[PDB]
């Protein structure tokens, strides 16, 4: 929800074209009294309470909560035999049918999330294979999130990435409160 | 708009076994968009409703109303096509099965009253429908006799039960 922006708007009575004058005098006729022809009541009128402008639904959960989120998701994967650890995402060949038939042979399931440590140093063979496969997806470590992990039936990790994830998520507890944004230099952060 | 009545002449029944009563012939016909009031047309429709073709044509001949000549045309057209296409032996042995008038599509004009006031006048149109059944017309149901009244009254008393017991 945090990224979502709503694009829906509608015109109110004030924003609809025309509708200046009083359609007929109040007292005189038998008609029901009106002030403008563009009122909500009328056909062609403005909306009483409608979608109003671009709307943002941005908010921030606390950091420690998002961190804990990643932790739970990872435990849950390993608890349910949905998590796999690999030395490297290196493939004998770039033929994408090899990767599908391997998952079939290893009872991984219909959708597999492949995580590597860095985007640049991802193997050639896995990139070729995964590029033309819908259900199998390759992400760098920094990409990893709760939504993808839940969406995919399998989570596959490398040994480089497992040490990396441990470092960062375990860093979250056993740290102080900040004095200033962590992008700034500290005596021991990066 | 719906045009069901026209299509009723396209129904084909499968051939009968020799051990069967001879099915009466069956003709549906109409005229659409007659410039005449639907309720005014009803009286003329109602009049001819159960009579034989010729007897209806006779009654319609001397009738002074506008729609009377219109209905006469429809009936003659229906009679002609009955003989020609619907394989009816004699043109005389037809009777009006059902005679109906519907509301046709109407236009709206304005009527100018005094002061500035006005009203909405409607150019009234209507349809007429007819159905012809080959054979002699049905003899009308006889008026209820005293004996029939009596008979049914006896029946009615004999139907009584002791109520709200076992």
């Amino acid at each position: 929800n945090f990224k979502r922006i709503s694009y829906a708007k509608t015109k109110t009575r004030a924003e609809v074209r025309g509708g200046g004058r009083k359609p007929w005098p109040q007292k005189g006729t038998g008609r029901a009294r009106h002030g403008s022809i563009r009122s909500p009541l009328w056909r062609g009128g403005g909306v009483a309470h409608g979608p109003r402008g671009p709307t943002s639904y941005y908010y921030m959960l606390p950091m420690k909560v998002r961190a804990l989120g990643l932790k739970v998701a990872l435990t849950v994967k390993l608890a349910q035999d949905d998590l796999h650890i690999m030395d490297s995402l290196e493939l004998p060949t770039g033929d994408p049918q090899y990767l599908t038939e391997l998952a079939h042979y290893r009872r991984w399931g219909d959708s597999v999330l492949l995580v590597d440590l860095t985007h640049e140093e991802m193997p050639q063979s896995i990139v070729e294979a995964t590029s033309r496969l819908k259900t199998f997806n390759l992400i760098p470590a920094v990409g990893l999130n709760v939504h993808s992990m839940l969406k995919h039936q399998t989570l596959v990790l490398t040994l480089p990435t497992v040490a990396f994830l441990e470092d960062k998520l375990l860093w979250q507890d056993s740290r102080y409160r900040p004095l200033y944004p962590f992008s700034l230099p500290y005596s021991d952060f990066p | 708009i719906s045009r069901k009545w026209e299509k009723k002449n396209k129904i084909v029944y499968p051939p009968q076994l020799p051990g069967e009563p001879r099915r009466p012939a069956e003709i549906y016909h109409c005229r659409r968009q007659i410039k005449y009031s639907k309720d005014k047309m009803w009286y003329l429709a109602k009049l001819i409703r159960g009579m034989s073709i010729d007897q209806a044509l006779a009654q319609l001949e001397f009738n002074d109303k506008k729609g009377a000549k219109i209905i006469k045309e429809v009936l003659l057209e229906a009679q002609d096509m009955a003989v020609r296409d619907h394989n009816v032996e004699f043109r005389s042995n037809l009777y009006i099965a059902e005679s109906t008038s519907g509301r046709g599509q109407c236009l709206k004009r304005i009527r100018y009253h005094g002061r500035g006031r006005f009203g909405i006048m409607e150019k009234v149109y209507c349809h007429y429908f007819v159905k012809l059944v080959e054979g002699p017309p049905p003899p009308p149901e006889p008026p209820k006799t005293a004996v029939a009244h009596a008979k049914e009254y006896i029946q009615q008393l004999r139907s009584r039960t002791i109520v709200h017991t076992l």
Partner: peptide, 17 residues
Amino acid sequence: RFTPPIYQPKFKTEKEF
């Protein structure tokens, strides 16, 4: 103490088939 009459627009009455 006078109320002027109002005419409906003419387009509705001039409709054809």
